[PDB]
Amino acid sequence: KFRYMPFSPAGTPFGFTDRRYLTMNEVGYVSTVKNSEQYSITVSFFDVGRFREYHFEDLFGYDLCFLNEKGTLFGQSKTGQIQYRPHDSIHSNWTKIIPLQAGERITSVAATPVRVIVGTSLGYFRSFNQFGVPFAVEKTSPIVALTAQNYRVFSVHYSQFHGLSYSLSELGTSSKRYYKRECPLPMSLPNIKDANLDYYNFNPMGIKSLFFSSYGDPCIFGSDNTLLLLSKWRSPEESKWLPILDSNMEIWKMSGGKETTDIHVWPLALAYDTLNCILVKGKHIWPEFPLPLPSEMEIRMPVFVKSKLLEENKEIQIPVSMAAEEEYLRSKVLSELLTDTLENDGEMYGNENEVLAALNGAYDKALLRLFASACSDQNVEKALSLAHELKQDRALTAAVKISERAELPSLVKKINNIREARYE
């Protein structure tokens, strides 16, 4: 039936070459080279000042890696051989063999500041600490993907008798709270020629990458080339998965409307309103060893229909109406995310309040541009519904002036009634 494969985030298959990337993320990239029945593993970092890159001679044949800001966790899937290496070389490396049955393989590994997490193909979930003391042997649905950032752990489970699901937890040095346990995951698995089959024999789930954002929101990049962010995950009754990049559509958009195949997106990280990702050119999805600079892709809410963009353009230029629509939606979801992260986790820098104010400014500017297109069609009720969602009292006077230019005095009276409700 179905076969499980060992997964690391943004790993690359071997292909016809003798080397591949074990893992790629915002900290760095770990790659392995076949070295005549042994391997040479090079760990390089994007942060040169904090971390110094290194390499070592691997004799066990590690095919799993996880790389965070305090350690590196290697794992061999077939024998259960795992190893944790701190970066600072003050704490010692440790090496451990976990029990694997016949047909059991380690599918994915993850590391935490105070824990080390190993997941097997039969559903076992073994948690050690950072020094090698075992702490828990749980049995869950078979974990095919792990990614941890600080004390937060995000996992994806799949089985024939359970279906696709995800679990998000925050273990911490204290306050052990599990956010969601094996709730179903809204993602499309790939439709199971050799350019895609060389990858899907290696990564059957279609997970290109699995990470957290810069503010701690989980993000997943499935086989449909869309970036799904989990919004309001702290409140389980209001949680929703927001697609914020349908990257095939923006690839088609920067190419001038041409149905383009030879360029692909390989995701690495999501900073605020920007996915850092290598735009891989060629017939292969995965990048090669001379790794280019990761390009920046601004997130766009998928409300773009190709028919209207082809109709007006007789570089794809978006009309101001649906550009205002997508700016309004993107500003609303980003304002919600920034408000939740600033209210719950606080600000990690000083820039978050002012960029939230400028984001609400761009929210109101897009709402006024929708209000103008409503008033241009003599649509009083849609204009009132648009300016009813206007957030700040500063931009309501602009709507009054647009109502004056459109000659809708009943709209002026109702917006002044809205203002009368707003003074108290």
Add this chain to the structure above:
Amino acid sequence: FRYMPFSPAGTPFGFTDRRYLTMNEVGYVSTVKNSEQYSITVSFFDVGRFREYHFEDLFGYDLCFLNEKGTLFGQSKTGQIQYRPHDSIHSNWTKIIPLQAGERITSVAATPVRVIVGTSLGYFRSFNQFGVPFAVEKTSPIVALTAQNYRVFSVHYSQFHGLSYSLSELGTSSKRYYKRECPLPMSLPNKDANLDYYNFNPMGIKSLFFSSYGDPCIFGSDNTLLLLSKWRSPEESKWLPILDSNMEIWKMSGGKETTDIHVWPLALAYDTLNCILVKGKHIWPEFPLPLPSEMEIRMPVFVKSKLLEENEIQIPVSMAAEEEYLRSKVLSELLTDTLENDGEMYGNENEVLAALNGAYDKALLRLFASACSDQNVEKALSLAHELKQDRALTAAVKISERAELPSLVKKINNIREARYEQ
């Protein structure tokens, strides 16, 4: 999977130019194929409120949601939806939904506040009633939608998640997911009418709506109307099968299996399923659509073998007593759930609780008499535990003295004393 478009109480073509799109308690929407052009006729059961209307369709609207204020059409291939309010003081609007390669709109929904598009890849899209979008979200792939009074009941299915349902509610501040993608207990289906219907509707959902008091209800391929009880508290929610319609048709026909009478559901009001009783080789309504009949809610505690060996079917006294007891129990807990949170809606319900508790106590007294007939003390005492009010215990102590059984009385009097004293 096919992922065919779904509209509630939708009827297939079936080598016929005319088919229905959506039937609810307010009316029905039908389409006519005519010279590569469709003609949409919408018609309302309440003919005294306003007027039915015809219009011209050059797009092929195979999706429709009909409410009391508007009609939302949708095209599954191109994605062009259109909202038409019934009164002419509100203008219609038309939107083109973005779709991917091989992506179709599976079901649409329209609230007086909200306009909802459900998509075969899970792209749950929301709008207000004037077409301004509010949210784009990815869920498990939609196969069914309904909504009323900013409450959204969705049913999802995929090969990697299975059957599930969601119970969203949108307040003005934030969204609230009551039960997000919890698994649904609806049985999927397993000759020409069957092939035509399950080619049109592979999920087998005949209809999917809300009750008149806001309770979600579903009618699938097993002809079993399920109601979602205790949905306001997600830790206590039960899916109650409140109608087994095959049992009701077998009881109506007189103990004879039939293959020419089926049911097509429209809506559920309190104690009554408003539905079309179809007659014919097909299971869907035809062009002379009859007046919508009503079927009473009957809990499936009826044994076919016992009813055929006992005998219009004359129901035995004990099975009827159990039927009334269970139906009064589930209706009491549902109505107490609705009025303690949502308040009064028609104002007659405060007497409905009193009459229904009287029927509940009456059915418990018939079970009391049936248990005391066979001289069972402890079973009758367990029945006497569940009595609601004090006035039922007077008839209970009347029955136990008639059957010369004082050992029941010595405990029923103590239960009465502990009830009124504490």
Add this chain to the structure above:
Amino acid sequence: MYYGISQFSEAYNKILRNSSSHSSCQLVIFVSCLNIDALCATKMLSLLFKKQLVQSQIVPIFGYSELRRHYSQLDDNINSLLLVGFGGVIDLEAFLEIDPQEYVIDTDSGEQSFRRDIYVLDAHRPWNLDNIFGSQIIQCFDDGTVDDTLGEQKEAYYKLLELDRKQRKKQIHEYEGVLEEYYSQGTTVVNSISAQIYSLLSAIGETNLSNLWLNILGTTSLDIAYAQVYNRLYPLLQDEVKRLTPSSSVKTPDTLTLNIQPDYYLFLLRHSSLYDSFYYSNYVNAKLSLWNENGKKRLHKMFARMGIPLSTAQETWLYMDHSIKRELGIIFDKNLDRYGLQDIIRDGFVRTLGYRGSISASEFVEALTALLEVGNNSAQKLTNLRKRWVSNFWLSWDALDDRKVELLNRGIQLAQDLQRAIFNTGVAILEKKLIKHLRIYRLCVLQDGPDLDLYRNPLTLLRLGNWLIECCAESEDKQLLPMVLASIDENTDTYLVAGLTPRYPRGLDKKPILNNFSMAFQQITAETDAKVRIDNFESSIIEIRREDLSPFLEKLTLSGLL
């Protein structure tokens, strides 16, 4: 002992903690000039300090007195000193008059710190026990022979220094006998400086293709007389080449590639003719005896047997018909077994970039060695001559750059001319039989010959010496004997004397032989009143007067420490 390999990185951090300052220069690297290994080592160190911005002063030093003159004039602001290719044999406190009392700062608690750090990057395995053990200021970059071999001498020296009748004599004389058994031992090399500095770069993480190529050159330069070192260090270089190579292609002007391909044991194959490559090779003349006319007849006969015409063989390798050079490996495999040249087959590293041609590691290190050699009242002549080879060393440093391939081609032409001169003087030695048998050592004295002014250079005399050792090593009829090679300089009027170790033939495959000439040279210098120069970093290189030559050789053959 003071720096094992796993803490080389730590040592580099200490260098930063003494030298990472933008305002002042504080790091001076003393490099032993006239050594390819030290040249490549200092090139990798200079690239590493350029990438991190450490101020530096690279000073090439020839003699020990030149070292003492340069260290005596050093400013007190300098706190980091790197000694590349030397400083591992002598006692640096006894030589540079180092006393720790005037160099100590903030001794207060058992902690000691100094105002100057002197690091040693030396490959000569006789390590001075005071220098490696009892010295805080002199810090050694040891390969790891101290943890495996030098433990008995460690405990003997520690209980010698700790304890300043029969028990005292019985233990102290025993430990002094162990220490004097470790001393009076010959000089050998088992590791290269470039390998240690590339291990440091692997510990830091500054490895790239250029530093790997410099490490390959530094390892390859020891393949003449220290083939066990190259055979030991070859798999690490193979792993590093296969690690830092790209995924794959078409020849394009920007893609530098560095392949492990068959690079035969020949002198300048890709920049000369095939006839001149076989004719001037040390191994081919070592086996087939090309110095007489019969060897030339046999070389022409094997050219007839290989199917290569002499018109095609004497043509330049770049202009050679590739119906000869494409299947040259098959021709080598089929034909060289009958003439005994099976060991010509050897896999090496070949680097090319753009369309300017391929270069091997062996051709590059002979080009660099030639650029060291002939790249461009008596005490003034010696000072000017030392300045001339320092200028030669900096010309060869200029040839290491990628943008200066004209210097590399000049080095190729100089290598061809110098090998012609070496071949002519070698057959001059072999024809008239100036090699004399002295029953403990073999003596070869050059009184006059063609272009004898090239042999005032050390490495040219070592090239002639390795020519003679390769030519006499394949002759099994005379056993392994050390060689004394003396060359006269008329203007200076001095015999420059080189001590050459013998070696086993290359086809065999054990314990390396040591260099026992430094012990005898030091003992004869101490006992006799010979005015001689010991200042060379290779201690087998001395300068004697003409009139004191024969008593020096008589005292050498009387001494039994050869």
